[PDB]
C-alpha cells in the first residue's frame, strides 16, 4: 500500500468562527499535508456547501484555497480535505483531514440610556440595519427603535420602576434575510426629580401703643380657708405704686405663713408703652408655697389686669385665671411641689376703630427674656418662685399669628421643581437648616428660627412666632426639603422665607 499522510486544516479565520461581517467576504482556507507518500504537487480537494475547491500541496506541506465565499462557510460548518498521493511504485492513497468551525452571525450593540427620552443610537455595529420595508422594531419592554427619514435609529426608552425586582435592561433582536442578527441591549437608566430653591416673604407689623399704669387686682377665688386679698406690703409681697390688691393668701399655716400669690406690675420698666407682636412682661408673679393644713387652699383665683390705652383713654381689663394645685405633701420633694397653671385668656379693645387683642402667653423665668414660656409652674414647699407674666398684643381678634402660604413645587423665584420621568413625586422630608433626609416631619409643625412651618407631602406649606424685637434686619428662615419619585430617587432644595418688620 501507499502510505497515507497527515492532512490538517487551520482555523477558519483566527477564531475558527464565521461571523456576520465575514459572511459577506471571501475567506482563505489553509492547512498542511505532510508525511507518508504525500508529495509536493499532490492534488487537494474539498467540498464546501456543495462546491468543490481544489489546489495542490506546496513546499513545506502547505496548502491554501485562495478564496472561499463566507456564505458557503456559513452554510457548511464541517468538511473533509482529501489529498491524493502515490508511492514510487504507483500505488495510490487518499489522506483525509476534517475541519469544523463555528458559525455565529450575531452582533450586539449595547447602550445605557435615560428612561423617558428618545435617543439617537450611535456607533451601531458595522452592517446594522432593518430588513427591507421595516422601519420600527418593538423592544422587549414595549419601546421602539425607529428608522427615521434622516437614516438615524432612535430608541424611545420606556419609563421603568428602578426599585422593583424586575430588570430594566431592554433588548431587541433584528434578524436579516441573510442570517445575520443584531441584538441591541438597552440598559435603561433611572431619572430623578430636581428640586429648585423657593423664596417667600412675610412682614410683621410694628405698632407702639401708649398705655397707662397697670393696676392688678385679685377679684375672685374658689375654695380656701382664711383667704385674703390686699395691696402688697414690705413684709407680704413687696410694695407697688397703687392701692389695687396685688396679693392673695390662703390656708391655715402648718409651719409658719400662708401660701399665696403676689403680682408686682412692670409699670416702671414699661414706660407707658406696649408694642404689637412683641412678648411683653406686665409684671412679676410670685408663688409663695408654704405648708398649710390640707383642704385649706384655693383651687383657682382670678386677677384683673387693668390699664388704659391712649387714642381719649379706653380702659382695658385682661382677666387672668390661675388654677392652683396645693398638692398633698409627702417625703417626695418633687411630688409635693405646688402647681400653678395660667389660662390662655385674652381681651379685645379698639383704638381709632382699629381692633387689637391682648393675649396671655404665660410664665417666663425672671431675667431670661429669651427663656421658654410655660403655662404651669412648680414650686417646692417652703419656697417662692417668680416668673414674668408675658402677654402679646396682636392685630385684630388674635385668632392667628402672621403667616404666609405657598407650594414648593411652584415657581417661587427660581423655577418649578422638575419631577423627572417617574413622577409620583412627593415631599418625604423637611428640616430646619441645610440638611434633610426622608423623615417624619412632613405634615407636622416644625420649629424654625423665627416661626413654625407645616410642609405637606403635596408641597403645600404654611409658615412667625418670634417677637418683633428678636427679628433682625435681613432675617431669613431656611428649611431644607426632600422630594422623592416613584422608585426612590430624591432631590433636596431650600425654602427661604424673608422675615421683615414694618
Amino acid at each position: 500500500e501507499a502510505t497515507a499522510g497527515t492532512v490538517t486544516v487551520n482555523a477558519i479565520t483566527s477564531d475558527d468562527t464565521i461571523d456576520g461581517i465575514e459572511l459577506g467576504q471571501t475567506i482563505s482556507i489553509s492547512g498542511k499535508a505532510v508525511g507518508g507518500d504525500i508529495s509536493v504537487g499532490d492534488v487537494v480537494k474539498m467540498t464546501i456547501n456543495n462546491t468543490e475547491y481544489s489546489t495542490t500541496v506546496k513546499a513545506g506541506g502547505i496548502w491554501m484555497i485562495a478564496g472561499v465565499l463566507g456564505s458557503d462557510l456559513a452554510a457548511d460548518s464541517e468538511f473533509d480535505v482529501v489529498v491524493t498521493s502515490s508511492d514510487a511504485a504507483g500505488n495510490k492513497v487518499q489522506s483525509i483531514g476534517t475541519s469544523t468551525h463555528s458559525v455565529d452571525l450575531s452582533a450586539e450593540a449595547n447602550f445605557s440610556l435615560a428612561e423617558g427620552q428618545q435617543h439617537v443610537l450611535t456607533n451601531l455595529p458595522e452592517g446594522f440595519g432593518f430588513p427591507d420595508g421595516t422601519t420600527e422594531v418593538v423592544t422587549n419592554f414595549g419601546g421602539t427603535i425607529t428608522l427615521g427619514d434622516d437614516g438615524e435609529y432612535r430608541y424611545d426608552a420606556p419609563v421603568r420602576d428602578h426599585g422593583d425586582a424586575v430588570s430594566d435592561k431592554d433588548s431587541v433582536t433584528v434578524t436579516l434575510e441573510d442570517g445575520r442578527t443584531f441584538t441591541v441591549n438597552l440598559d435603561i437608566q433611572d431619572s430623578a426629580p430636581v428640586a429648585v430653591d423657593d423664596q417667600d416673604s412675610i412682614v410683621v407689623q410694628h405698632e407702639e401703643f401708649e398705655v397707662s399704669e397697670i393696676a392688678a387686682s385679685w377679684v375672685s377665688y374658689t375654695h380656701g380657708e382664711s383667704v385674703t386679698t390686699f395691696d402688697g406690703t414690705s413684709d407680704l409681697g413687696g410694695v407697688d405704686n397703687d392701692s389695687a390688691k396685688d396679693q392673695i393668701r390662703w390656708g391655715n399655716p402648718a409651719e409658719s405663713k400662708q401660701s399665696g400669690y403676689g403680682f408686682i406690675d412692670n409699670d416702671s420698666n414699661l414706660e407707658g408703652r406696649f408694642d404689637l407682636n412683641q412678648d411683653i412682661s406686665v409684671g412679676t408673679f410670685t408663688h409663695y408655697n408654704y405648708p398649710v393644713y390640707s383642704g385649706g387652699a384655693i383651687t383657682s383665683a382670678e386677677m384683673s389686669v387693668e390699664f388704659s390705652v391712649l387714642d381719649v383713654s379706653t380702659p382695658v381689663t385682661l382677666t387672668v385665671n390661675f388654677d392652683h394645685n396645693e398638692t398633698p405633701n409627702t417625703n417626695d420633694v418633687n411630688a409635693s411641689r405646688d402647681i400653678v397653671t395660667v389660662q390662655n385668656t385674652h381681651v379685645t379693645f379698639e383704638r381709632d376703630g382699629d381692633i387689637y387683642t391682648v393675649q396671655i402667653v404665660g410664665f417666663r423665668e425672671v431675667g431670661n427674656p429669651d427663656g421658654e414660656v410655660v403655662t404651669s409652674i412648680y414650686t417646692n414647699e417652703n419656697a417662692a418662685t417668680s416668673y414674668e407674666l408675658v402677654v402679646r398684643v396682636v392685630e385684630g381678634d388674635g385668632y392667628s399669628l402672621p403667616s404666609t402660604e405657598g407650594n414648593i413645587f411652584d415657581d417661587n423665584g427660581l423655577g418649578a421643581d422638575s419631577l423627572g420621568a417617574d413622577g409620583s413625586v412627593t415631599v418625604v422630608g423637611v428640616a430646619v437648616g441645610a440638611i434633610v433626609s426622608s423623615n417624619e416631619s412632613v405634615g407636622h409643625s416644625i420649629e424654625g428660627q423665627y416661626g413654625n412651618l407645616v410642609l405637606n407631602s403635596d408641597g403645600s406649606y404654611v409658615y412667625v412666632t418670634a417677637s418683633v424685637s428678636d427679628i433682625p434686619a435681613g432675617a431669613t428662615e431656611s428649611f431644607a426639603y426632600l422630594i422623592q419619585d416613584q422608585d426612590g430617587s430624591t432631590s433636596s432644595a431650600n425654602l427661604s422665607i424673608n422675615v421683615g418688620t414694618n
Binding site: 402648718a254 405648708p291 398649710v292 393644713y293 390640707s294 383642704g295 398638692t327 398633698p328 405646688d338
Partner: peptide, 4 residues
C-alpha cells in the same frame, strides 16, 4: 391627710 395633713399638709399641702
Amino acid at each position: 391627710g395633713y399638709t399641702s
